[PDB]
């Protein structure tokens, strides 16, 4: 009854707020088409727009954000997290004080289920070809490969080194439209930038002009669960519980200062 | 001392075995050079 | 040894089977990094070419060179894997390779 009563009171607060529903509508639309983070300014802006249309005085912003978070937990088991600012990266949940915001999926595995999804998609690909789901899947896959690269690169690898490692895995650096994705990897990179998955660093050395390295962007960083990362690697090599803590520490090494921990 | 002894033995294995393998490399280079010294002349004869 | 069709085609066949076995050692090296495969393939191809000495069909030379390139890469990679007992570079390929049924 905890869920029933809690959702009932949620519905009550809904009687005080349909605004939250519309909010998550825009939330999930913007993400699904875009896979997007959203700024605190945008939040309060649409909030004021709504408050005007609702013709009701603006309640607490912290109130609102917490309310909707709880909504989409009881409905979705998810957490809305705001991001600490980029200035805090190079120089209590803040919530209402946090600046950039997205949704996080809060359940653990259900191992057999994920594997069975693997199986369905296996039917898929084996039948496939000698896509947008799969298109993004490749996009993310290259992403993850590069993530691993940077991790073996200890959160720092130059542009050209990355380029070589891409060629290392048969990636055409010629500048052609990306197979299946029909774009350039550069555009992918600019996405991860806007999708905050990466960090691009450009330094004007007087001998070699602007030298560019890259680091892990906070979208991935907040995304990148530690145990998630680790068991991920275990699954990369099909590993048992034996090398667990050993490779755990090897991964700690690969990280270093990768995250603003 | 004894740690240096173990390091000396391990570096012995490393240097000697890897050097043997590098000589394997060298003789492979020689054989491949022989291939471009013979098959290339076969090209010379055939094409001319 | 100057123009026996049987010798040439058997060289072709042995080399094709050699290609298959070298693909096997490709995955072997990717998981492990053995140099014996490279050296032995080198010896095999060189011996077969020694039999091809006097025989002068281009395709045999082309395929032999293919073998040469493959074996050289085999040896270099195995040496790299020998120098120390990267891992992700090994893993991502293995990740790609293990996703290569």
UniProtKB/Swiss-Prot annotation, chain A:
Keywords for this protein: Cytoplasm, DNA damage, DNA recombination, DNA repair, Nucleus
Domain of life: Eukaryota
Gene name as annotated: NSE3
SMART domains given in the database record: MAGE
Subcellular location: Nucleus; Cytoplasm
InterPro entries named among the record's database cross-references: MAGE (IPR037445), MAGE_WH1 (IPR041898), MAGE_WH2 (IPR041899), MHD_dom (IPR002190)
Pfam family, one: MAGE
Any one annotated GO CC term: nucleus
Assembly with partners or alone: Component of the Smc5-Smc6 complex which consists of KRE29, MMS21, NSE1, NSE3, NSE4, NSE5, SMC5 and SMC6. Interacts with NSE4. Interacts with NSE1.
Name the record gives this protein: Non-structural maintenance of chromosome element 3
UniProtKB/Swiss-Prot annotation, chain B:
Compartments, as annotated in UniProt: Nucleus; Chromosome
Name by which UniProt lists this protein: Structural maintenance of chromosomes protein 6
Family per similarity comment: Belongs to the SMC family. SMC6 subfamily.
Misc. comment: Present with 339 molecules/cell in log phase SD medium.
Domain free text: The flexible hinge domain, which separates the large intramolecular coiled coil regions, allows the heterotypic interaction with the corresponding domain of SMC5, forming a V-shaped heterodimer.
Function: Acts in a DNA repair pathway for removal of UV-induced DNA damage that is distinct from classical nucleotide excision repair and in repair of ionizing radiation damage. Functions in homologous recombination repair of DNA double strand breaks and in recovery of stalled replication forks. Probably plays a role in structure.
Domain of life: Eukaryota
Subunit structure comment from the entry: Component of the Smc5-Smc6 complex which consists of KRE29, MMS21, NSE1, NSE3, NSE4, NSE5, SMC5 and SMC6.
From Swiss-Prot, chain C:
Record localization: Nucleus
Quaternary state and interactors: Component of the Smc5-Smc6 complex which consists of KRE29, MMS21, NSE1, NSE3, NSE4, NSE5, SMC5 and SMC6. Interacts with NSE3.
Family in the record: Belongs to the NSE4 family.
Primary role: Acts in a DNA repair pathway for removal of UV-induced DNA damage that is distinct from classical nucleotide excision repair and in repair of ionizing radiation damage. Functions in homologous recombination repair of DNA double strand breaks and in recovery of stalled replication forks.
UniProt name for this protein: Non-structural maintenance of chromosome element 4
Higher taxonomy: Eukaryota, Fungi, Dikarya, Ascomycota, Saccharomycotina
Residue range from the parent sequence: 40 to 179 of 402
